[PDB]
Point group: C4
């Protein structure tokens, strides 16, 4: 489960990185950062400048938000929770 | 279900597109983009400049956030999930 | 239920409106807008300029996010849902 | 439960405060503010300027969002809810 959501999230972020670096002309790291803060809904960066970028982002949000949060919901409930929960047992 | 949330989301976005292009003077694509990143709570664009825009946005958020995320919750759990889940079966 | 969350949300927003208009010197409408986009996590406006504003905002987020989304979760599931659901019945 | 999520959230925010003040050169209060609005997904501030800051933020979001919202979900359902719910009983 976690591993699958892990791969699915990675692929989604790779696509975004490739897209924004190419179409919005961002350095790969900045393209990855934008992809991440967009799908996690933080949105702390300026928006895309091109219409292609705006259209892709709209679709990217609708298709990727569900996945990204599904992964986060498991990364903290099925991986981070035990490490602390079990450790909370003397 | 999915089709209904599909239509409801579309109509909500159409209203926002019409509103922001008219009142905030945005090009349709930019009006749609603002509507989308606002309802999905990304919020990566500058805020509305007019008081009418601010008031509408406040109401738009409260009335549209629930719907938009309801659609996303189905688009990934009742449409994207199987495609990958079933395919995860050798 | 809905009415209680309605009042609780209103009071929370009134406090924010009073706070930001006074401490950050915002016009009431802008103070309300900031309060709304902050608690709904849209965050499309610049951040507070004063330390008092930053501290209050941190506490305001932790105490108000839960309430605001609780209200939204009811406004769309216990009020907007039927209007369309029942109407979806020929 | 609440106390544990309380401590876990505090530690997470302390790490962010130390990180951003050091690497992004922010005053402690601003470092804390950025950490808070990032993990709660408000994202109303400009993004990190350094690559180290961008990389850390990406990891910080994925590891901290789950925890922070877990704490919020309890702070309003297991602490703020009763205070008003029980009080809603004549
Ligand atoms: K946001
Ligand atoms: K959310
Ligand atoms: K958000
Ligand atoms: K934002
Ligand atoms: K901004």
């Amino acid at each position: 489960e976690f591993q699958v959501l892990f791969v699915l999230t990675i692929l989604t972020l790779i696509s975004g990185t490739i897209f924004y670096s190419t179409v919005e002309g961002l350095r790969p790291i900045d393209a990855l950062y934008f992809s991440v803060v967009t799908l996690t809904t933080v949105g702390d960066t300026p928006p895309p400048q091109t219409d292609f970028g705006k259209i892709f982002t709209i679709l990217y949000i609708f298709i990727g938000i569900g996945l990204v949060f599904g992964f986060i919901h498991k990364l903290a409930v099925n991986v981070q929770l035990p490490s602390i929960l079990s450790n909370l047992v003397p």
